[PDB]
Amino acid sequence: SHPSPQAKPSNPSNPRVFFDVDIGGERVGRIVLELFADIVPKTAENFRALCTGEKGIGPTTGKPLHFKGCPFHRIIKKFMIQGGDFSNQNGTGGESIYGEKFEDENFHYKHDKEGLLSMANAGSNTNGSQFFITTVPTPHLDGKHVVFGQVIKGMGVAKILENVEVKGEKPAKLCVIAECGELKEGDDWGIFPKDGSGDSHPDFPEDADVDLKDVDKILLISEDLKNIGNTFFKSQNWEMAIKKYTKVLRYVEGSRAAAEDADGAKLQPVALSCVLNIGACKLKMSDWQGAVDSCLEALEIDPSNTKALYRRAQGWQGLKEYDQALADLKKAQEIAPEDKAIQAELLKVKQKIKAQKDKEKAAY
Known part of the structure; x- marks a missing residue:
């Protein structure tokens, strides 16, 4: 054989x-x-x-x-x-x-x-x-x-x-x-997604014409796909927006794995923005654990990202993990003391903790 x-x-x-x-x-x-x-x-x-x-x-x-x-x-x-x-x-x-x-x-x-x-x-x-x-x-x-x-x-x-x-x-x-x-022969491959979005890229980057080591082309593809994700976001289609942002991350992942360290760094801004956008979509759909997980991913790229800390605390609140929410918001506040949204969310979580503890110990 x-x-x-x-x-x-x-x-x-x-x-x-x-x-x-x-x-x-x-x-x-x-x-x-x-x-x-x-x-x-x-x-x-x-x-x-x-x-x-x-x-x-x-x-x-x-x-x-x-x-x-x-x-x-x-x-x-x-x-x-x-x-x-x-x-x-x-x-x-x-x-x-x-x-x-x-x-x-x-x-x-x-x-x-x-x-x-x-x-x-x-x-x-x-x-x-x-x-x-x-x-x-x-x-x-x-x-x-x-x-x-x-x-x-x-x-x-x-x-x-x-x-x-x-x-x-x-x-x-x-x-x-x-x-x-x-x-x-001469037939189109027909391997872009049939979802009416105009996306001309294969869902899996290994199938794309592009060398994954060509980070500059991967960056332009990523921007194209991100843009399509935003088209869905602006029409409140959270699920399809996540599909496109997630596909940007597949291209980014394949490229960072094929390319050299310093080239791959070029893709982090676009990856961060797509991970943040996915976290936003998951909150819209009350997927609290999904949001928490996506926010972690963001903080793994940018540890001082107050957007990601704030949203993670919102995901933690959905899970009724208020100690985690408090800690994230306190850390966010330290980084961004002028942020009024974070100030207000800390008060809200502190009130939630008190009310929860009161309910747990109250007796007739």
């Missing part, structure tokens, strides 16, 4: 197909896959056709030979995600474009990395329509399952799938291939 291809794609002439994935009725993103037609032409072609649905209705199932609407029925964190049972949706059905089952074509490639596309089966020469995507190397499957493609965009969507809540191995939420098909 041969190591699986490191380049993405392995071969410019290999077909590319995609899955748009929904979880609990919400679009999570697109996964783009390379199919290894240069090595397993028959297995690749089966999967390609099931992405387009072009072969029509399966004779043995009487259902469309097509992945659209098909759930991921079996998911095991830190192993794989399995789907493709378009007829029974539970691992007992599906069929191939060649008949109910077809032969193991070859076992050329090793299951030696995450992101590999491989045929599910019930033993030798029992390939149908079901597949899995690995999320780790799975060499124990070598020689038993035909490896026939790899993820080339959207591994991060596959990572979200792998981490869904499950009962046994069945997702609690419906995880489905909402749309699917084949990308022709």
